[PDB]
Structure formats: structure tokens, C-alpha cells
Structure 1
Amino acid sequence: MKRTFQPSVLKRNRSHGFRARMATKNGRQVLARRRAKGRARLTVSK
């Protein structure tokens, strides 16, 4: 079947990327919670 995750890096980058999530203040809290919860991989990097 046409399964749901038909992936890319172009869809991925402009949605869940760094400068996307660290654009707005509501995004920024996720970057300031993934920090404080001590996650290694912040959002997506290659």
C-alpha cells in the first residue's frame, strides 16, 4: 500500500528544521525544552 511516510529532506528541512523551529517564539520553547531535557539530537541534522 501507499504507506504514510513517503520521505524527503526538502519537506523535512523547511518544516522541522532548525531555522524553522527557531523562527517563532512558540517554536523556540521546543528548542529550549529539548535543551533542558538534555536531548543530544536537537531536531534533525543530516
Structure 2
Amino acid sequence: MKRTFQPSVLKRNRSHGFRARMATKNGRQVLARRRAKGRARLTVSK
């Protein structure tokens, strides 16, 4: 039947992107943890 992931780009980058992660304080802490582990992909890339 109808599954649980119908993709989009605007709805993805609007609520998971780098700019929407710097809007809050907890998002900045999330980015700090991602940088502290050492991942190649911080939030998202094109």
C-alpha cells in the first residue's frame, strides 16, 4: 500500500538543514557533537 516515506527537498532542507540547525541552542549543541565525533557529513550536503 502507501508507504511511510514520500520524499521532497524543500521539506527536507527546511527542517533538517544547516541553517535550521543553527537557529536554536540545542541545534548548535547537536552540531558540536557531530563535529566532536569526526563525521564527514555534518548535517546534509547537496
The answer to whether the superposition gives a TM-score over 0.5 is: yes
Q: Report how far residue 2 of structure 1 moved.
A: 1.0
Identity %: 100
How many Å separate the matches in 2 of 1:28 and 1:2? Answer: 35
- Structure 1: which 5+ runs fail to align? none
Computed over aligned residues only, the root mean square deviation of the Cα atoms, in angstroms, reads: 0.7
1:24 maps to what in 2? Answer: 24
Structure 2: which 5+ runs fail to align?
none
Cα distance in structure 2, aligned partners of 1:9 and 1:33: 25
Scaled by the length of structure 2, the TM-score of the pair is 0.91
**Cα deviation 1:1-46 (Å, max 9, x = unaligned):** 1111101111101100001011110110110000001010011111
> Equivalents in 1 of 2:43, 2:5: separation in Å?
18
Aligned residues: 46
TM-score, L = length of structure 1: 0.91
